[PDB]
Design an enzyme around this catalytic site. Structure first.
Site, PDB file in Angstrom:
ATOM      1  N   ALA A 139      39.814  44.967 -19.503  1.00  0.00           N
ATOM      2  CA  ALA A 139      40.804  43.721 -19.254  1.00  0.00           C
ATOM      3  C   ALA A 139      40.862  42.887 -20.537  1.00  0.00           C
ATOM      4  O   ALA A 139      41.524  41.835 -20.537  1.00  0.00           O
ATOM      5  CB  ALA A 139      39.765  42.817 -18.136  1.00  0.00           C
ATOM      6  N   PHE A 140      40.600  43.521 -21.722  1.00  0.00           N
ATOM      7  CA  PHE A 140      41.039  43.171 -23.085  1.00  0.00           C
ATOM      8  C   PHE A 140      40.755  43.968 -24.220  1.00  0.00           C
ATOM      9  O   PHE A 140      40.125  43.327 -25.365  1.00  0.00           O
ATOM     10  CB  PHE A 140      40.400  41.382 -23.341  1.00  0.00           C
ATOM     11  N   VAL A 181      41.443  48.216 -25.803  1.00  0.00           N
ATOM     12  CA  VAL A 181      42.035  49.295 -25.676  1.00  0.00           C
ATOM     13  C   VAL A 181      41.293  50.306 -26.122  1.00  0.00           C
ATOM     14  O   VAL A 181      40.458  49.877 -27.321  1.00  0.00           O
ATOM     15  CB  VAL A 181      43.527  49.318 -26.508  1.00  0.00           C
ATOM     16  N   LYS A 226      36.825  51.450 -29.402  1.00  0.00           N
ATOM     17  CA  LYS A 226      36.956  50.463 -28.413  1.00  0.00           C
ATOM     18  C   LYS A 226      37.556  49.297 -29.419  1.00  0.00           C
ATOM     19  O   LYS A 226      37.052  48.890 -30.296  1.00  0.00           O
ATOM     20  CB  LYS A 226      36.096  49.953 -27.804  1.00  0.00           C
ATOM     21  N   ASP A 246      26.412  46.815 -14.109  1.00  0.00           N
ATOM     22  CA  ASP A 246      27.533  47.043 -13.641  1.00  0.00           C
ATOM     23  C   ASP A 246      27.463  48.734 -13.701  1.00  0.00           C
ATOM     24  O   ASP A 246      28.542  49.308 -13.956  1.00  0.00           O
ATOM     25  CB  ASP A 246      28.829  46.561 -14.276  1.00  0.00           C
ATOM     26  N   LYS A 248      28.210  51.651 -11.741  1.00  0.00           N
ATOM     27  CA  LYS A 248      29.347  52.266 -10.912  1.00  0.00           C
ATOM     28  C   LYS A 248      29.773  53.249 -11.663  1.00  0.00           C
ATOM     29  O   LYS A 248      29.754  53.906 -12.760  1.00  0.00           O
ATOM     30  CB  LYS A 248      30.141  51.205 -10.542  1.00  0.00           C
ATOM     31  N   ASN A 295      31.577  53.857 -14.862  1.00  0.00           N
ATOM     32  CA  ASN A 295      30.771  53.926 -16.035  1.00  0.00           C
ATOM     33  C   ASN A 295      29.806  55.102 -16.551  1.00  0.00           C
ATOM     34  O   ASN A 295      28.790  55.076 -17.085  1.00  0.00           O
ATOM     35  CB  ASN A 295      29.662  52.520 -16.132  1.00  0.00           C
ATOM     36  N   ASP A 319      29.775  51.380 -21.175  1.00  0.00           N
ATOM     37  CA  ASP A 319      30.391  50.150 -20.849  1.00  0.00           C
ATOM     38  C   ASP A 319      29.110  49.107 -20.816  1.00  0.00           C
ATOM     39  O   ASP A 319      28.859  48.945 -19.643  1.00  0.00           O
ATOM     40  CB  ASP A 319      31.345  49.984 -19.998  1.00  0.00           C
ATOM     41  N   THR A 355      30.159  44.459  -9.720  1.00  0.00           N
ATOM     42  CA  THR A 355      31.126  44.466  -8.937  1.00  0.00           C
ATOM     43  C   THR A 355      30.428  44.402  -7.497  1.00  0.00           C
ATOM     44  O   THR A 355      29.642  44.859  -7.194  1.00  0.00           O
ATOM     45  CB  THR A 355      31.533  46.018  -9.225  1.00  0.00           C
TER      46      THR A 355
HETATM   47  N1  GVD Z   1      33.346  51.092 -23.064  1.00  0.00           N
HETATM   48  C1  GVD Z   1      34.169  51.308 -22.326  1.00  0.00           C
HETATM   49  C2  GVD Z   1      35.277  51.407 -21.231  1.00  0.00           C
HETATM   50  C3  GVD Z   1      36.177  52.856 -21.144  1.00  0.00           C
HETATM   51  C4  GVD Z   1      37.560  52.698 -21.297  1.00  0.00           C
HETATM   52  C5  GVD Z   1      38.410  53.516 -21.144  1.00  0.00           C
HETATM   53  C6  GVD Z   1      37.983  54.823 -20.701  1.00  0.00           C
HETATM   54  N2  GVD Z   1      38.919  55.918 -20.942  1.00  0.00           N
HETATM   55  C7  GVD Z   1      38.856  56.948 -21.265  1.00  0.00           C
HETATM   56  N3  GVD Z   1      37.812  57.445 -22.143  1.00  0.00           N
HETATM   57  C8  GVD Z   1      37.634  58.554 -23.096  1.00  0.00           C
HETATM   58  N4  GVD Z   1      36.478  58.947 -23.863  1.00  0.00           N
HETATM   59  C9  GVD Z   1      35.646  58.128 -24.314  1.00  0.00           C
HETATM   60  C10 GVD Z   1      35.406  56.570 -24.186  1.00  0.00           C
HETATM   61  C11 GVD Z   1      34.225  56.630 -24.808  1.00  0.00           C
HETATM   62  C12 GVD Z   1      33.431  55.203 -25.072  1.00  0.00           C
HETATM   63  C13 GVD Z   1      32.920  54.722 -23.951  1.00  0.00           C
HETATM   64  C14 GVD Z   1      33.866  54.100 -24.520  1.00  0.00           C
HETATM   65  N5  GVD Z   1      33.970  57.643 -25.667  1.00  0.00           N
HETATM   66  N6  GVD Z   1      34.824  58.452 -25.285  1.00  0.00           N
HETATM   67  C15 GVD Z   1      38.833  59.437 -22.659  1.00  0.00           C
HETATM   68  C16 GVD Z   1      38.667  60.910 -23.299  1.00  0.00           C
HETATM   69  C17 GVD Z   1      39.746  61.589 -22.772  1.00  0.00           C
HETATM   70  C18 GVD Z   1      40.561  61.595 -22.323  1.00  0.00           C
HETATM   71  C19 GVD Z   1      40.542  60.107 -21.226  1.00  0.00           C
HETATM   72  C20 GVD Z   1      39.622  59.231 -21.700  1.00  0.00           C
HETATM   73  N7  GVD Z   1      39.646  57.983 -21.129  1.00  0.00           N
HETATM   74  C21 GVD Z   1      36.635  55.080 -20.606  1.00  0.00           C
HETATM   75  C22 GVD Z   1      35.695  53.878 -20.674  1.00  0.00           C
END
Ligand code: GVD
Ligand code: CL
Length: 301
Positions: A16-17, A19, A35, A128, A130, A133, A149, A169
């Site tokens: 929510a803020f 990438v 992050k 949280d 869930k 996470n 998270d 949540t």
């Molecule tokens: N912290 C936090 C929130 C979060 C935000 C986005 C998220 N998505 C995500 N995360 C990841 N990978 C990931 C995320 C992390 C770290 C936990 C943030 N380490 N690796 C991938 C890897 C491959 C394809 C798609 C992915 N999507 C996973 C966790």
């Protein structure tokens, strides 16, 4: 420093803020997830929440927790460099399996409990817990579940409770939070109960589209084990769920205790090995529901 130490690639996902972009350490080529928090417009108070998360994540070092390797501050942008996990959500993985039993669900909950126990040993309450996470480290059949998270985590002093705020949540919120009572470590064990429940039958124990009737259910601890689906679930599984879904948080089972529950520590002789197709079908619907976001299953703003 950040673009001298890491190279950002594609976006993995979002918050929510924030990438999350895949990145590579310069010049070694090792992959991580970064992050990225735009901090230009943040209040001091919001930056202090980022400071808390960075601090808490730096503390935690466990096989079942996504490890923070680096917290980089630049002008207008902060970077939290984590271990990369490529297995996606545990819950999405479960629905693609041909064979899924209570012994599998036990294996998962055991890992989740080891991460929660490590948090609690280190004075950290996640708040949280869930499916969102709970991520698999890789796409391997043997991949560890890792806790992610800590954007809502709090630091507690021992076993002292406090009014840490109304946060989390809805579907997974504990009675004491809803009651505006002081709380602590037990709130994570209520959340694990809810998760375990959904892991066995594929739908949540507390459900009502009216948020008010949802909270009245939770506070009253009004969940059941309806037929036919629960009839095939072992008494030991229900007993663990009961011990976690205890309204009085003083009497609720702890993580350490839950790790010594026979369904967990004697999985191979206690957990049922029967495939639970109907759970996989329900989890499919559950996951699909979650994708839609909205009131019950989405972290509160
Ligand atoms: N912290 C936090 C929130 C979060 C935000 C986005 C998220 N998505 C995500 N995360 C990841 N990978 C990931 C995320 C992390 C770290 C936990 C943030 N380490 N690796 C991938 C890897 C491959 C394809 C798609 C992915 N999507 C996973 C966790
Ligand atoms: Cl490290």
């Amino acid at each position: 420093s950040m673009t001298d130490e890491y190279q950002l690639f594609e976006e993995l996902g979002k918050g929510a803020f924030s990438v999350v972009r895949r990145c590579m350490k310069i010049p070694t080529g090792q992959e991580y997830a970064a992050k990225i928090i735009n901090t230009k417009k943040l209040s001091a108070r919001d930056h202090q929440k980022l400071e808390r998360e960075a601090r808490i994540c730096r503390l935690l070092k466990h096989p079942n927790i996504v490890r923070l390797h680096d917290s980089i501050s630049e002008e207008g942008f902060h970077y939290l460099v984590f271990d990369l996990v490529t297995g996606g959500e545990l819950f999405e993985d479960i629905v693609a399996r041909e064979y899924y039993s209570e012994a599998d669900a036990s294996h998962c909950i055991q890992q989740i409990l080891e991460s929660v126990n490590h948090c609690h040993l280190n004075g950290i309450v996640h708040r949280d817990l869930k499916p969102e996470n709970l991520l698999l480290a890789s796409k391997s059949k043997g991949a560890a579940v890792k806790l992610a998270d800590f954007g809502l985590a709090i630091e507690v002093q021992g076993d002292q409770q406090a009014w840490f705020g109304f946060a989390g949540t809805p579907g997974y919120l504990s009675p004491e939070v809803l009651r505006k009572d002081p709380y602590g470590k037990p709130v994570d064990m209520w959340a694990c109960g809810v998760i375990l429940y959904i892991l066995l039958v594929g739908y949540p124990p507390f459900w009502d589209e009216d948020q008010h009737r949802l909270y009245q259910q939770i506070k009253a601890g009004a969940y059941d084990f309806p037929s036919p689906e629960w009839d095939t679930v072992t008494p030991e599984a229900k007993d663990l769920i009961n011990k976690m879904l205890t309204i009085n948080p003083a009497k609720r089972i702890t993580a350490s205790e839950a790790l010594k529950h026979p369904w967990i520590c004697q999985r191979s002789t206690v957990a049922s090995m029967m495939h639970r197709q109907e759970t996989v079908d329900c989890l499919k619907k559950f996951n699909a529901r979650r994708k839609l976001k909205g009131a019950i299953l989405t972290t509160m703003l």
